[PDB]
Amino acid sequence: MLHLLEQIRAYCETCWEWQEAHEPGNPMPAPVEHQICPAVCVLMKLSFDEEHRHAMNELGGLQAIAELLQVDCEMYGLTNDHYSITLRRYAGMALTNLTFGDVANKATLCSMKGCMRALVAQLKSESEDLQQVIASVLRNLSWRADVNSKKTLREVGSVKALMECALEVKKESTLKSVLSALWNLSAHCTENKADICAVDGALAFLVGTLTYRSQTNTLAIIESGGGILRNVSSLIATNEDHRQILRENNCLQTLLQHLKSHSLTIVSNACGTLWNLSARNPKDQEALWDMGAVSMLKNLIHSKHKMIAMGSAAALRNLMANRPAKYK
C-alpha cells in the first residue's frame, strides 16, 4: 500500500491555495516538480484490480483523482503539453475503472460539478487519446445513470460536446468510445435526442456510419452509430427538415440493406429506426413500399429476438396501415 492519494491530496492543496490567491481579477505550481504523472500512473494501473478499487473507494481515491484532473484543467486549460495531457489521460483511465460497475462512484463523480465541466472541456483537446479516455468516462457515467446523474450529464452540455467532438475524430478507437457514450445518452431523455439533431452536420454523419468501411475487421462503430440513429429517429419522424437530410444521404436504402446483415444488433437498430420512420410520412412510406420493404419485414417477424420480432412487425404494421394509392 502506497498513499499516492496523500501526495495528490497535498499537491491539490498547493494548487488550491494558489487559485485562492490568484483569482479571476505569482509562480504557478508545476506537477513535474512533485512527480504527479508517475504517481497517478501507478493509481491508474492499480484501479484494474477490484481488490485495490475496494481500498480506493473507502479512502476517497475517486475524489482525489477527480480533484487532480479538475485543478490541472482549470489551471493550464487546453494545452498540448506532454506531461499535462498524460496526467489527464491516466486520471481519466483511473476514473473509467472506478466508475465501472459502480453505482456510488458514478453518482459522486457526477455530483462533482466542477470536475464534470473540466471533463467536457477536454473533448476539444487536440490529443485524440485524451478524447477517447474522456469519452470512456462519460460512457460509463451515461450507462444506467440515476436521475441526478442523467440531469447533470445534460446540465454540462456533454451530448453537444460529444457530437461536435465526433464530427472531427480521425481515429477508430476514439470514435468507438465517443459513439458508445452518445448511444447511452440518446436513451436518457427527448431533449438529449433533440440536441444530437440540433448540431449541424450531425445527422448526415450518422447516416455515414451505416456504410463505414472499418479497418481491423469489426462492426462496433456501425452498431453504435445506427444505435444512436435508432434512439433519435423517434423525433426525426415528426421533423420534415431532418427527414430530408436522411433522404439525401440515402438512409432508407441502407436501412433496408442492413436488414440482410449477419450482425444481429445492426438488424435490430434497422427495425427500430424503420418503426419510427415508417409512421406519419406518406413519401417515406411510399418510398419503402417501392423498395420492397414489406417482403423484407415479413421474414423477420418469426425471429427469436424480442426487439427484431417487435420492430419488424410494428413497422410492417405502419406500412400496411398506410398503403399508397398506386398499390390498389
User: Footprint of other proteins on this chain (CB under 8 A)?
Assistant: 44, 47-48, 92-94, 96-97, 99-101, 132-133, 136, 139-140, 142-144, 173, 179-184, 224, 227
Give min distance, CB of 37 to other proteins, in A.
Answer: 16
| Residue placing its CB nearer to other proteins in the complex, 252 or 307 | 307
Shortest distance, position 222 Cβ to other proteins, whole Å: 13
Least distance (Å) from other proteins to the CB of residue 180? 3
Nearest distance from C-beta of residue 279 to other proteins, angstroms: 25
Q: Of 11 and 143, which CB lies nearer to other proteins in the complex structure?
A: 143
Q: In 3D, which of 215, 204, 118 has the Cα closest to residue 158?
A: 118
101 or 282: CB nearest other proteins = 101
How near is the Cβ of 169 to other proteins at its closest, in Å? 15
- CB 208, CB 249: distance < 8 Å: yes
* CB nearer to other proteins: pick between 169 and 319: 169
Q: Which CB, 186 or 318, lies closer to other proteins?
A: 186
Contact present, 203 and 246 (Cβ < 8 Å): yes
